[PDB]
Design a protein around this ligand. Sequence first.
Ligand SMILES: O=C(NCCCNc1nc(Nc2cccc(NC(=O)N3CCCC3)c2)ncc1I)c1cccs1
Ligand SMILES: O=C(NCCCNc1nc(Nc2cccc(NC(=O)N3CCCC3)c2)ncc1I)c1cccs1
Ligand SMILES: [Cl-]
Ligand SMILES: [Cl-]
Lengths: 618, 618
Amino acid sequence: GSMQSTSNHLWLLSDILGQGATANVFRGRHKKTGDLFAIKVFNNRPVDVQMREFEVLKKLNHKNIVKLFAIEEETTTRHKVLIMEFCPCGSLYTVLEEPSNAYGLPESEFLIVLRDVVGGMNHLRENGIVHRNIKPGNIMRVIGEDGQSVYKLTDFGTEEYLHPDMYERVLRKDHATVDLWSIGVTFYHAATGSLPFRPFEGPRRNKEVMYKIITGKPSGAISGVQKAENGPIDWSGDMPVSCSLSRGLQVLLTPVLANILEADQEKCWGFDQFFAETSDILHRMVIHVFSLQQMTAHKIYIHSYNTATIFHELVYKQTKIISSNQELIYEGRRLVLEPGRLAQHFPKTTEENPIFVVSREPLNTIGLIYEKISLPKVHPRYDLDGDASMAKAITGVVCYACRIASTLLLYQELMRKGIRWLIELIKDDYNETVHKKTEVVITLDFCIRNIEKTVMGEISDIHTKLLRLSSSQGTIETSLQDIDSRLSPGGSLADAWAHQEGTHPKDRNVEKLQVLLNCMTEIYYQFKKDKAERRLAYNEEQIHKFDKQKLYYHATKAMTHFTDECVKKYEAFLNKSEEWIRKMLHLRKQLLSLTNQCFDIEEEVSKYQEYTNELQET
Amino acid sequence: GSMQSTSNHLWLLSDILGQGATANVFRGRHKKTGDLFAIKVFNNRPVDVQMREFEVLKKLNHKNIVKLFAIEEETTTRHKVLIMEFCPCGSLYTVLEEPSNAYGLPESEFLIVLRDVVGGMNHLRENGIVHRNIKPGNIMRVIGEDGQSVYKLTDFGTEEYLHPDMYERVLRKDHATVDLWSIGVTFYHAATGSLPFRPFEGPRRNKEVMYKIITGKPSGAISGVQKAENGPIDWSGDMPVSCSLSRGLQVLLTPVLANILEADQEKCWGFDQFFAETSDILHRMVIHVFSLQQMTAHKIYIHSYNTATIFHELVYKQTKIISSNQELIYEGRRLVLEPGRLAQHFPKTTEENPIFVVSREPLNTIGLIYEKISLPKVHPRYDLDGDASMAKAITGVVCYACRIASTLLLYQELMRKGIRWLIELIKDDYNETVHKKTEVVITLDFCIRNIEKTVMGEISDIHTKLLRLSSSQGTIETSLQDIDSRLSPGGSLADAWAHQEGTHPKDRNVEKLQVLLNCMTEIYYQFKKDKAERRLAYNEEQIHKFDKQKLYYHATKAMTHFTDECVKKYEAFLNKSEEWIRKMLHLRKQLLSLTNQCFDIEEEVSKYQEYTNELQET
Ligand SMILES: O=C(NCCCNc1nc(Nc2cccc(NC(=O)N3CCCC3)c2)ncc1I)c1cccs1
Ligand SMILES: O=C(NCCCNc1nc(Nc2cccc(NC(=O)N3CCCC3)c2)ncc1I)c1cccs1
Ligand SMILES: [Cl-]
Ligand SMILES: [Cl-]
């Protein structure tokens, strides 16, 4: 294999990173240092319209823009090459081909994409550049020095991403929102793993159904899918259920998408509003909350400067528990947020260490809501392109199952923890009120009896009325004994079942699934190599056919384990939780009542304390 | 490349897994399924001494023994091949070459190795086989179906691992412990990343110093290292400081090693005792405990059936806090273990969620104790063998730094959590005693004054003596106000500094280090490839020299970040903890005193309650 070069760099033609009509991108090295760079080489005026536009870029300096170092002359010809920042990881496209992201990026990653695309976008605009076609292949990923992805825009100056006016194909007239469209599609694709507008078959074969979908899209819809050949379009303003993003994030993103995926440029958002709206999301912090009675996890997207009041409102939006019914638990103890306490001063939370919320009012136990996705059928006919894409799809289904199994395990672990804490909490209450009582029994038994016992009627009415109180306290004692016994080891309120039901970390169900998944992923990546390599030799051919069966046998094993082990035991744990919750609410409601009687007893005794002493002559 | 085969399998000669004097091991496939297997082929009597010993093995069935499926005839010759279980991961040797394990295996992995080596060993013995030479290259690793390693013995029937009698080289006379020796060396190597007996330079060049080390080893020593040329030997009965294993595990393992690394076979352990002793370790569960005043994490190795009593004893061994001074905290609240409560019923713990222990008695704040390891110098002379081994070594140092930085971050995170909990705990105490007090003030202010106020001396002495009590309670009130103000936001006992000092997860120091480490590890693995490939072409040669500089620049960047950021801020946080601890102990000791006065007041008032009422004529 051989190489072109310039004064300072050199590169294999085999080591190509990208191909456009205008130019090609290879990875090469600086000859003096050995350092990796992307070399952009143009295949072809006016001569200096380019040296100028090249110069403008060489000046651009920004975190979210692939850097243009220098411009050089290839040695063989006086052709211009651009030396650009090499990004070993590739593009957002590469990321979304990972079977792991078949149903959307992980939330944190999606947020980085959102941030960086928006940042790069702005920078161009600030400098007045318009990037006509933003798409995942345009958006380069790099590992930052802190290990987090940094996304970077390159190649400024695809059907599925072109605006309706653009899809037709008259140079856009005279000047951007059209950019917002492809950003709209890009973000949706990153959020869900899918293109938002999908004629049956492909957009490619059905360019016409596709334009009909995009133009005739009702307002608010963010997707339209044709599920059958020549069938109708299903519209939605919602994220698909299979999407990983939290309800907290979904609720914020959806409106941004609806408003930048608008056909009439009359009512598109306009950039600034888009910048303002996206930044409002990006500037929020996340507080993790888990709803114990609903068996649901939540992310609350809240500004640093927002109050607890707003926090309760946000929680209410996702749970339907009104502010005043919201009872908070954190790290074993009650959390009491003063209304005006800023979110920046709330205690630190994670998905594994959330703030729990409980109500004294009945809620339906929801649990995790997820798509039921079954394996596609494997087509026995051998095909290097077909099998690669099928391998991707089936591995995608198993990863999803794996992701859901992990969430299912988390939900049960949080439940077990939440329940443990709440029981010790109720237990405190029982002891707080059981103290008070013994402390007021002290007045009946010590004062009224013993005080007036010391030496016409009303007195006959007082000693007897008081007896009704000790009588009333006796009704209290036996109702507390009943609650204590319920809170104890034998009790109807016991923890035990939660250790007996569902699945536990030590079961290693997630790990068992990942092992199977890793087997499928090696095969998928090989089918990726088998595709690129256009024909296999006899043995390799056979081996490829074998592994096509192995994929399926691995995928079936996984789905069976998922449904019969993970889902089954999970549903058993949930149904038991439903019952334990109802008993708990009823118990707390009795104890409350026993607590209020204690106050009502306590204060009448607090009146007759004085009645012992009359005025005296003197 | 071409292949031998048999009726049912075939294999490249390039795809070799192992080479001994007697035979070779390649990886091949079943021709009908495509499945991977290890093919052992013998290079050479009596003819059937072998078909018999082959048959014995084909019968062996055990989790920790590489499985022998069948015996077949190679096609070209009637030579015998063994078809064996293929283990894609390789051997314990491969694992210990990973720069990640330069200073020993992670604790969990070490325990699996221990378990599996012991299990396989026993199985052979149960069947009466003796494996003369156990070593990491003998011990095969496989990923189990739950994702955990399973280790498996193969090749039954190295200098560094041979017993002193064996090192000499008379067929061992007539018959095992000699096996125990190599197990001794193997476990030590797995625990520390190093051979226990090391002449300066290598064992290879110094076969003679090596035998002198092993034979002249004082009893109890588990290692002897010659650190200078012709220098003396440093002996130890302890694990090196750089070893990852917990003190809890070290304390148990060390005696096993001392007793199976014994020269006089008179006083070696003998297998059964070894089996009993190792199993005693393997059958223990681990309870994670964190000592708040010492800033130390601990693993308590305890049987399921052991009592809390034993638990306290074990904790005392590692902390020097006697049982009765041990105060336990778990998930925000006090933990009170009944003496006879079984460890199996203790609450579940992890390193991130330990039981905290505190004392009311002063302890030195120790923190984490770790080796200071600096980068070796990089030798500028180009050498494919030399550079590979150097790349390994320098990457090993950085991984260690990374491992320590992670532990350092954990220790600070646990401190912050522990302190948070303890403060709410002390806070409870303040409120428990501040209740009691107001509850007894009720008797002074309500009863004695008001009771005898109602209508010769001693009475003159009582009203005045009582005044000394309200007087005494007034001394109490202002001392509580003082403690409350200390426990509040302004207080000398505040949390604030802990958020201001040390390093936090959001700093991403561990991630910054891993990124650097990953760069070094790609280079190391390439130098591994450059070594195997005996000479590099001019460019590759240059590129290899460049990256040899890149390693160093990456390693320096890492060490600088480690010492100047991780270690520095950590040491600042620790020094502040030292001070906060002392204030806390002093505060708790005052509150205790204020709590006891409250009892002493409370009970004298409890006597004069009766003194109000004399006997009456009637
Ligand atoms: O698209 C284009 N330019 C941007 C992309 C090519 N440019 C660069 N690439 C990288 N590094 C890099 C590393 C690994 C993989 C890849 N790419 C892929 O894996 N891909 C591409 C989509 C098919 C999958 C790229 N560094 C810097 C650049 I500048 C162009 C199209 C037409 C003209 S320029
Ligand atoms: O040592 C020996 N037999 C046991 C080892 C060879 N046998 C097997 N190997 C594997 N799989 C496997 C996979 C990847 C790597 C490797 N090995 C290595 O990476 N190594 C070897 C130490 C040098 C590093 C092995 N499967 C099954 C077997 I059976 C022998 C020595 C002399 C005769 S037999
Ligand atoms: Cl480009
Ligand atoms: Cl072998």
